[PDB]
Structure to design on (263 residues):
């Protein structure tokens, strides 16, 4: 529990599923992001119980939870500040002029975080470049893992809804609501595609409904030009129709390291 007397509110960072997010300082020294949770957007009591366990997730490629302010409304969630913002918009700026080793290193940063969550049996359920952040050193970290469970908006939580992450979801989630470790593995392969495509929308010429149809029939995202055959094999292994045939994050990490040594 953070005392809100120790917070300042300095700049607006944007709006997400739970409303406004601000940049500020904690104890007049530490940069933070402050999620000011909008009324009616979150299952707050359930989150508060879960914050207790989320306080114990700590890994250098996971955005760090610093605390919460819950003796009040709105409630606040206080996290590590990531100066370069979301990975999706970062990938789309042509000025960075990324080398392919930098793109693989972004995939590796996210896979390390995901291997740590897998080790804790903890699902993200919305892994995508819009939900990863980049710090001032260009390190990518995974954000808002596990928070999908507390979203009140039916347009986000229904697999037929307008905000559901259709293009990052495997066929068994779309058809059957079958969530597992393997549904995050599928999203991870889509996130590698987003990285190697410099932030294009997956299935860029299709709607969500058409994408759901395409992937249940076996078709997959094409190889981005910047991906080698070896990088494409890694992302494509995440898309096996049989969930049990998809790798684990531990296996993907070893794959990514072997390709970095190769390239
Ligand atoms: C830390 N942190 C979070 C943010 C943003 C952060 N940092 C920055 C830093 C710089 C800039 C900037 O303006 N520029 C200008 C151009 O050059 C690049 C830099 C913007 N943001 C940050 O450190 C955030 C904000 C809004 C919304 C969200 N957001 N995103 C996904 C999301 C997803 C979900 C789910 C549950 C639907 C999955 C739930 C959510 F509440 C959110 C959510 O609040 C976040 C990200 C982070 O939460 C805070």
């Amino acid at each position: 529990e953070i005392d809100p007397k120790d917070l300042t509110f300095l700049k607006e960072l944007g709006t997400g599923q739970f409303g406004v997010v601000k940049y500020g300082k904690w104890r007049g020294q530490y940069d933070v992001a402050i999620k000011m949770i909008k009324e009616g957007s979150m299952s707050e009591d359930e989150f508060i119980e879960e914050a207790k366990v989320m306080m114990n997730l700590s890994h250098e490629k996971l955005v760090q939870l610093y605390g919460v302010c819950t003796k009040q409304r709105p409630i606040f969630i206080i996290t590590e500040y990531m100066a370069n913002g979301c990975l999706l918009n970062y990938l789309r700026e042509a000025r960075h002029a990324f080398q392919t080793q930098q793109l693989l290193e972004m995939c590796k940063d996210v896979c390390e975080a995901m291997e740590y969550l897998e080790s804790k049996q903890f699902l993200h359920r919305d892994l995508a470049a819009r939900n990863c952040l980049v710090n001032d050193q260009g390190v990518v970290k995974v954000s808002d893992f596990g928070l999908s469970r507390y979203v009140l908006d039916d347009e986000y939580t229904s697999s037929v809804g307008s905000k559901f992450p259709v293009r990052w979801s495997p066929p068994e989630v779309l058809m059957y609501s079958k969530f597992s470790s393997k549904s995050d593995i599928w999203a991870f392969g889509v996130l590698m595609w987003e990285i190697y495509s410099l932030g294009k929308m997956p299935y860029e010429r299709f709607t969500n409904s058409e994408t759901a149809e395409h992937i249940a029939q076996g078709l997959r995202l094409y190889r981005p030009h910047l991906a080698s055959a070896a990088v494409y094999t890694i992302m494509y292994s995440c898309w096996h129709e049989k969930a049990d045939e998809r790798p684990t994050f531990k296996i993907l990490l070893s794959n990514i390291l072997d390709v970095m040594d190769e390239e």
